[PDB]
């Protein structure tokens, strides 16, 4: 699209409509973009000394990108609630994007006095990496997505990436991608950039919780017909004499019943409690946390494989890195106290996946014989096994929406671990930069790189609309399901509202599983 200077390049679309089966969440926000790295690509690396587990090598670019991989960039409390309360599941189908009403300003810091003014002509160029030839950054839970609250103006993030490294230094194989080596489209004012995408058949996120659970799944009333090993030894006057007898598992017997499927896999996490007291006093934050390691650098295992966060009656506990944790609007960056964060809870799964903090089961160790007692041992890490079945990490309104499946020789069940939809070809990276403006050059020629540009930034609005599909409920469940509600009682502030000084804020994390489906 194209037009004039006194012509709005696009209108403001920010609705949300439900169609019974679909529902489209349109949404627009105003943004701003500075000139990063003063227009140059800069090489960047870990700090020489820095622990090995923390080295790196890569580049930062003068390019800034766009991102809305956060559910709340599309759903509004209320809306989300609608969804989350009457749908067995849902998934994204297609999207449409558009930047417009772009405007380029140029600040002038003459002595003690700045003065911003329109640089009409100068441009901002955009380009979408629709061929995925660029290090996909999104999906890395970074923060600089869209504001949950419309009215909020925002700054565009700067693109940076990482290649290979042998400590703080580069290794040859590492590649250096240059963003100008693409065909950016250049916008001036009166210019807009639209583009549209279509998702790929993915599974509806399961937005329901299970009423039955693996173990308790058969019918009480009837005993099976298969037998199991009831007792081993037997009374012989005073002493026992080994004599194995078997029984037919019934209701009273349950624990012993024969089955057909196994809980999901696991990778044991340390348990910490919301109650300061209980927790051993010391620094096992890193030392005790569950991790894995590549090329000799141990990394953390955050968002551990999807597994319930606490047994019955222990909402007080949680994994050291088995859950998602968001900050309460305002919460500072580092070492903030428990009271400043919102920890997610995944009890809803208990029913199928193991509890993060407790071992999977316990396999037998030795082979018993008359002169040898029967061994056994608990298992803290069980990789996928036939017959296992499980549930993936719920979603949360202010959580990630999707993530790119890495291009590898092999993947195994790609639901992104941080939760979300695992996409092979996700929404392409959208980039934006401000074509430089060489400030006054010298009369006599010089072949040096230009270094003195006009100080200036850009701004303008952006809009994103997405169509989601739904799987409606359908249970013959007689008694009421659970629903997500807002507290009745009076409060000094409404949830998901602007305070007295107009600061919007999300009180709690809102999950997705409320409706109840049987297993």
């Amino acid at each position, epitope marked *: 699209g194209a037009d004039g200077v006194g012509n709005s390049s696009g209108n403001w679309h920010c609705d949300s409509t439900w169609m019974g089966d679909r529902v489209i969440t349109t949404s627009t926000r105003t943004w701003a973009l500075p000139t990063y790295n*003063n227009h140059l690509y800069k090489q960047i690396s*870990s*700090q*020489s000394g820095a622990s090995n587990d923390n080295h790196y090598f890569g580049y930062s670019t003068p390019w800034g990108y766009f991102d809305f991989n956060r559910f709340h960039c599309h759903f509004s409390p209320r809306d989300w609630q609608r969804l989350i309360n009457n749908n067995w599941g849902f998934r994204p189908k297609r999207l449409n994007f558009k930047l417009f009403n772009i405007q380029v300003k140029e600040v002038t810091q003459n002595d003690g006095t700045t003065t911003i003014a329109n640089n009409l002509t100068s441009t901002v160029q955009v380009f979408t990496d629709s061929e995925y030839q660029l290090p996909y950054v999104l999906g890395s839970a970074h923060q600089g997505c869209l504001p949950p609250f419309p009215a909020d103006v925002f700054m565009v993030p700067q693109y940076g990436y990482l290649t290979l490294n042998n400590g*703080s230094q580069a290794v040859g194989r590492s590649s250096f991608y240059c963003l100008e080596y693409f065909p950016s489209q250049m916008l001036r004012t009166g210019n807009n950039f639209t583009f549209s995408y279509t998702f790929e058949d993915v599974p509806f996120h399961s937005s329901y919780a299970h009423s039955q659970s693996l173990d308790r799944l058969m019918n009480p009333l009837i005993d099976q017909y298969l037998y199991y090993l009831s007792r081993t030894n037997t009374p012989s006057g005073t002493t026992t004499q080994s004599r194995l007898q078997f029984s037919q598992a019934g209701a009273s017997d349950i624990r012993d019943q024969s089955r057909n499927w196994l809980p999901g896999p696991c990778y044991r996490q340390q348990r910490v409690s919301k109650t300061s007291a209980d927790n051993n006093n010391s620094e096992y934050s890193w030392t005790g946390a569950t991790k894995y390691h590549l090329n000799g650098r141990d990394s953390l295992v955050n968002p551990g494989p999807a597994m319930a966060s606490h047994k019955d009656d222990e909402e007080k506990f949680f994994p050291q890195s088995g859950v998602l944790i968001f900050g309460k609007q305002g919460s500072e960056k580092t070492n903030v106290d428990i009271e400043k964060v919102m920890i997610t809870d995944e009890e809803e799964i208990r029913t199928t996946n193991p509890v993060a903090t407790e071992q999977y089961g316990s396999v037998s160790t030795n082979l018993q014989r008359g002169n040898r007692q029967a061994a056994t041992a608990d298992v803290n890490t069980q990789g996928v096994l036939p017959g296992m079945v499980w549930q993936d990490r719920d979603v949360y309104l202010q959580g990630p929406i999707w993530a790119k499946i890495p291009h590898t020789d092999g993947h195994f069940h790609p639901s992104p671990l941080m939760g979300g939809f695992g996409l092979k070809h996700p929404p392409p990276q959208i980039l934006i930069k401000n074509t430089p403006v060489p400030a006054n050059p010298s009369t006599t020629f010089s072949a040096a790189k230009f270094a003195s540009f006009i100080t200036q930034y850009s701004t303008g609005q952006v809009s994103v609309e997405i169509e989601w599909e739904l799987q409606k409920e359908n249970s013959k469940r007689w008694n009421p399901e659970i629903q997500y509600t807002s507290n009745y009682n009076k409060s000094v502030n409404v949830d998901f509202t602007v305070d007295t000084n107009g600061v919007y804020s999300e009180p709690r994390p809102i999950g997705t599983r409320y409706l109840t489906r049987n297993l």
Partner: antibody, heavy 120, light 108 residues
Framework: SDVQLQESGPDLVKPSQSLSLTCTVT?????????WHWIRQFPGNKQEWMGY???????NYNPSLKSRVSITRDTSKNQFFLHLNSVTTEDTATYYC????????????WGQGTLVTVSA | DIQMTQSSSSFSVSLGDRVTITCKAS??????LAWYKQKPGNAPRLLIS???SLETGVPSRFSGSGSGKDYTLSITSLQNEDVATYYC?????????FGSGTNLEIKR
């Protein structure tokens, strides 16, 4: 004010001669990390950055000085050296060696400094 | 080369007072600026790097702020150890360049 590292070298040098200084480091290894720099201060006050040598042995020099400066290293000794040729009176100054916490930032540790005067 | 200019050439202050020093760059440094302290007859010492990050062992009284062209170093309550000249240094691009320095005479 405070730091560690020690420079050594002749106090006096004749003009057209070459200046050679050595910086001996203790409490740290020249390899494995950090870039070691040379900086000088003219008697008036200003600081001027001469150049550096990386842990890997790569060097970078100030463009003004580039033609007559050379920085080298002796890992065994844990010392790095500065060689400045075609010295002039302007070269008189206190020379410092310093470590650079590298990657993001700069000079974490500085030497005492050695005064070098260029006179006939 | 990027040129750094430091504000007050000299200040006199006593223990306990708050002092502020300014440094501005010819071009946008992008917070790659460090502050050093130098005592008489002594070599410089690193106070702050990355414009605002305190070096290990540096007291909380020291703080730095700034962005773009202009940066500032502030000492909340001067201490006797504080007497010295302070220099700002840019490491955005080679060659690295230093400011002219500000002499703080603490000591009545």
């Amino acid at each position: 004010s405070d730091v560690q590292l020690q420079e050594s070298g002749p106090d006096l040098v004749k003009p057209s001669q070459s200046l050679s200084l050595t910086c001996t480091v203790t409490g740290y290894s020249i390899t494995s990390g950090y870039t070691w720099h040379w900086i000088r201060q003219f008697p008036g006050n200003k600081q001027e950055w001469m150049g550096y040598i990386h842990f890997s042995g790569y060097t970078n020099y100030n463009p003004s000085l580039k033609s007559r400066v050379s920085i080298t290293r002796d890992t065994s000794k844990n010392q790095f050296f500065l060689h400045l040729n075609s010295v002039t009176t302007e070269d008189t100054a206190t020379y410092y060696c310093a470590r650079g916490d590298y990657g993001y930032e700069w000079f974490t540790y500085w030497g005492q400094g050695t005064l070098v005067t260029v006179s006939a | 080369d990027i040129q750094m200019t430091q504000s007050s050439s000299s200040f006199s202050v006593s223990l306990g007072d708050r002092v502020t020093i300014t440094c501005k760059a010819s071009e946008d440094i992008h917070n790659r600026l460090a502050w050093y302290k130098q005592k008489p007859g002594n070599a410089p010492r690193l106070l702050i790097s990355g414009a605002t990050s305190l070096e290990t062992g540096v007291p909380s009284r020291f703080s730095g702020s700034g962005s773009g062209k202009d940066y500032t170093l502030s000492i909340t309550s001067l201490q006797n150890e504080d007497v010295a000249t302070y220099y700002c240094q840019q490491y955005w691009i080679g060659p690295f360049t230093f400011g002219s320095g500000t002499n703080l005479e603490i000591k009545r």
